[PDB]
Paper text:
Titin is a protein expressed in the skeletal and cardiac, or striated, muscle of vertebrates that plays various roles in muscle structure and function. Fn3 domains have a characteristic beta sandwich fold, with a core of hydrophobic residues as the “filling” between two beta sheets that pack against each other face-to-face.
Fn3-3 and Fn3-11 are found in the non-repetitive region of A-band titin near the tip of the thick filament, Fn3-20 is in the second D-zone super-repeat and Fn3-49, Fn3-56, Fn3-85 and Fn3-90 are located in the 1st, 2nd, 6th and 7th C-zone super-repeats, respectively. Fn3-20 is at position 6 of the D-zone super-repeat, and Fn3-49, Fn3-56, Fn3-85 and Fn3-90 are at the 11th, 10th, 6th and 2nd position of the C-zone super-repeat, respectively. Both the Arg15908His variant in Fn3-3, and Ser23226Gly variant in Fn3-56, however, result in the loss of polar contacts, and this is reflected in the loss of thermal stability of the domains. We see no evidence for dimerization in the crystal structures of the C-zone Fn3 domains determined here (Fn3-49, Fn3-56, Fn3-85 and Fn3-90), agreeing with these findings, and our crystal structures of Fn3 domains in the D-zone and at the end of the thick filament suggest the same organisation of titin Fn3 domains will also be found here.
Numbering used by the authors: 3 to 105
Write the structure that this text describes.
């Protein structure tokens, strides 16, 4: 009974100039104990390092990510944690370009 497995590929939606919604599913493998929260990370397209996209983990399976740079392209990934700790991350989401209202 250890940490969870990866969630499935997250989905990104409701993209504005500096916010987006990231949604995902509960990992198929919870490691044998209840999922207590999720880490969400982001990576600018063709940058190497993944960084925190939210200040602290969330419990719901979606969140509004803020503080994104207009004109930049980002991908997101999600890691689940249980009482035993953090599991490996999901595969990266599709990338999204941060652009303001197209109308
Ligand atoms: Zn954690």
């Amino acid at each position: 009974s250890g940490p969870p497995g990866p969630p499935e590929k997250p989905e990104v939606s409701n993209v504005t100039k500096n916010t987006a919604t990231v949604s995902w599913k509960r990992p198929v493998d919870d490691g044998g104990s209840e999922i207590t929260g999720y880490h969400v990370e982001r990576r600018e397209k063709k940058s190497l390092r993944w960084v925190r996209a939210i200040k602290t983990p969330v419990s719901d399976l979606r969140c509004k990510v803020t503080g994104l740079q207009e004109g930049s392209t980002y991908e997101f990934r999600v890691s689940a944690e249980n009482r035993a700790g953090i599991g490996p991350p999901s595969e990266a989401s599709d990338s999204v370009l941060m652009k303001d209202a197209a109308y």
